[PDB]
């Protein structure tokens, strides 16, 4: 690329609509604003309370183990390194949405009941 001919991308730039400069462009005199220019949420009652300590573990579609090399020593500190989980919080929960493939050692805080059998069917271990 040379520095003379810097053609931008089409539609990547736009000129500013400058408001109030002359009647020909539109927005001429009144500047696009025209001449002389209980709510609902204060009728809906509040909803119980909130818990001071909710424990939300990291959940991963059963389908996250379908893209891994071999079901062995699948510890959460390897889930967090490769980054299938973006952040370890309280615990790592496994969900039973999806189909499994081979056997893979799983180490999780909790387990769904439908998620428990699908690793127990492929040949994996569920160590909590």
């Amino acid at each position: 690329m040379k520095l003379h001919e810097l053609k931008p991308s089409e539609g990547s730039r736009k000129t500013r609509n400058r408001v109030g400069r002359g009647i020909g462009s539109g927005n001429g005199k009144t500047a696009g604003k025209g001449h002389k220019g209980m709510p609902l949420f204060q009728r809906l009652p509040k909803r119980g309370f909130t818990n001071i300590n909710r424990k939300e573990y990291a959940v991963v579609n059963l389908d996250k183990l379908n893209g891994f090399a071999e079901g062995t020593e699948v510890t959460p500190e390897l889930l967090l390194e490769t980054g299938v989980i973006s952040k370890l919080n309280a615990g790592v929960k496994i969900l039973g949405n999806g189909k499994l493939e081979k056997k893979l050692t799983v180490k999780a805080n909790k387990f769904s009941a439908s998620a428990k059998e699908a690793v127990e069917a492929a040949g994996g271990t569920a160590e909590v």
């Binding site: 690329m1 810097l6 053609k7 931008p8 991308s9 990547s12």
Partner: peptide
């Protein structure tokens, strides 16, 4: 192969 859109905004 170049990508000259990526060379305009980068400058």
């Amino acid at each position: 192969e170049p990508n000259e859109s990526v060379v305009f905004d980068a400058i």
